[model samples]
Target: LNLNIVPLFEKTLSASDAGRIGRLVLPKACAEAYFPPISQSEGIPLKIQDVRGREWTFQFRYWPNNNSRMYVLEGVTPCIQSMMLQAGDTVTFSRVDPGGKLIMGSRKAAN
Candidate 1:
């Protein structure tokens, strides 16, 4: 099957708890693409490849805020730790493959 590549969003890593907690913030569009309606499922299952091409499956959660909803990939701390992701790095998320697989990659800025 062909891979369905969608550019979800790009974000600069912030000095936050994303590393320790494994919570990744998703844009509205990316959340929608990665997760189904909240009514159908509270968590979404996905297999994503990291920058080095290792695949990890995470049960990401869909959180509902006052005005909007967000998605966070659970169990991502190891990947972030392994990648040594630092603040200011550019991170990208995209859905791939035929069956809802996703991929996340990062790049550190030049000094």
Candidate 2:
């Protein structure tokens, strides 16, 4: 299944609430794609191919409102040595806290 998640809004959160969190206005298109029942077990699927002939597959979750949210990226780290991610790369949703701070990151592999 293909699921799409869009940001709802962008707002600067306090340091206590979010660590170096920046605010962003969630576009209507993104809000419309928001799913409230997403989780690690129900994470989205993503495949990234690096330049070194390595394939990375994993899931990532982010909160649009708060940066403190528990963000997680899980999967395997591709064998490719030169592959890196850029902005607007399509990744999977793993986990997210109410504030949306990345807490976990992984590439598809045995961990």
Candidate 3:
């Protein structure tokens, strides 16, 4: 059996907002099968400083499957330093599943 998994992005923070930021749809599936709960065990929080002296926190994790195929997850704070991303970066919640012989991707702007 095959599954069609979709990737999603939820904004945990924003430069304009002090607290939680809005959510944004990602372009591709970040993972397949299961997306474990966000915690110290499932994933880790990442911290990065933008070019404008703004610091951002996000979460990320590697795909947990033994299919020999791997997916690298990454996040970029737009208009910021392209190479500013570092370890412990956080990411929005997302999921991905195998889709036949092809993979689908999508993304939506934050509200």
Candidate 4:
């Protein structure tokens, strides 16, 4: 049987609130998925392979008392810099299985 699995999370490129390429903010839903367990009181490290065959390690950081406890990707400048994404592009994060390595990809907006 032919079967296909959908991505765990996806978001179209949005204006960076920080107005910088330092980090990519994870939406609340996606963030919740990566939130470190209460027992683990530290940043969660994730290894993601980009579309261009580059693998980057990003730390999942949870901010306190920010309302929504923003989860963000730390050390993401390299990925954004390499992507050269403008506005309207789409980014997707997924894994083949629950315990599989993370996979990341991008789609540029059509002109």
Candidate 5:
């Protein structure tokens, strides 16, 4: 497998992340450094893949909060359900070298 993978960021799921809202909050530093910058509130559509090569398109946007921004990735319910992720699970973000596609991995919490 010539898929060169570059690590980007990792996040531990939170209550809101695994909640019914289907929105995942991202670290402001990570979002600004790795993901594309948004010009307006609408943000941009982002495509990401799981370890199994499953693809999903999510809305990469931010919310204004106290003169700052809270970056969030929306519409992740399907992937979350499929991966069986929970509040304690950890998710990693990496990029494929050849195609430069975003890839994600989930580590279930040990019970």
Candidate 6:
């Protein structure tokens, strides 16, 4: 598709991440570098696309951490279900160049 991909971050899913909680905790550095800064706990909507061109809108928010912030993406259950991701799977985030659209990709863990 001639996508100029800017790799943002890769995360190994945990039971909580790939399970029913429906929240994805992002690495602090990755969230700070790529996502917009948010002051409120109720953050803005973030639109991310899959490799198949399907888009998923998630709440890109943060929680108060020990005098810091814990960045999270909420409402990811359907997308995780669609990807069939499990605790050991790896999820990748990237930015598509030209448009700067966020892209989500996943891989099954090697046995």
Whichever of 4 and 5 has more lDDT, that candidate is 5
What is the alpha-carbon RMSD of candidate 3 to the true structure?
13.0
Q: What lDDT does model 6 reach?
A: 0.90
User: What range of 10 consecutive residues in model 6 has the weakest lDDT sum?
Assistant: 1-10
Each model's Cα RMSD:
2.9, 13.2, 13.0, 3.3, 1.6, 1.7
lDDT of 3 by residue, 1-111 (tens): 756544444333234222223222222253333333342323554443333455455454444346533332234434123333222233444333553222212223332
- Model 6, span 1-111: residue lDDT tens: 575889988989999998899999898788988887888997999999998878999999988899988989999999999999999899999988887789989999988
| Worst 10 contiguous positions by lDDT, candidate 3 | 16-25
Highest lDDT: give the candidate number. Answer: 6
The lDDT for every candidate, in the order shown, is: 0.69, 0.33, 0.35, 0.67, 0.89, 0.90
lDDT of 6 at 51: 88
Candidate 1 per-residue lDDT over residues 1-111, each given as its tens digit: 556777667767666634566766666676665555455336767777875679877776766776766666677677777777877777787766566666788778657
Deviating ranges (above 4 Å) for candidate 4: 1-5, 17-21, 34-42, 66-68
Q: What TM-score would you give candidate 3 relative to the actual structure?
A: 0.26
Q: Candidates' TM-scores?
A: 0.72, 0.26, 0.26, 0.75, 0.92, 0.93
TM-score of predicted structure 6: 0.93
Q: Candidate 3 — which pairs collide?
A: 27-106, 45-88, 46-88, 46-89, 46-90, 58-89, 58-90, 58-91, 59-90, 59-91
Error of 3 at 44 (Å): 0.9
The sequence of per-residue lDDT tens digits that candidate 4 reaches over residues 1-111 is: 443445878767667722476667777676676433422324678788876679998876667645546567777767876877755777778775435567788778877
Extract clashing residue pairs from model 6: none
lDDT of 5 at 106: 85
Which consecutive 10 residues in model 2 have the weakest lDDT in total?
A: 16-25
Task: Please give the lDDT score at residue 23 for candidate 3.
Answer: 23
Instruction: Give per-residue CA lDDT, model 5, range 2-46, as digits (tens).
Output: 778899999899999998999999998899998888967768999
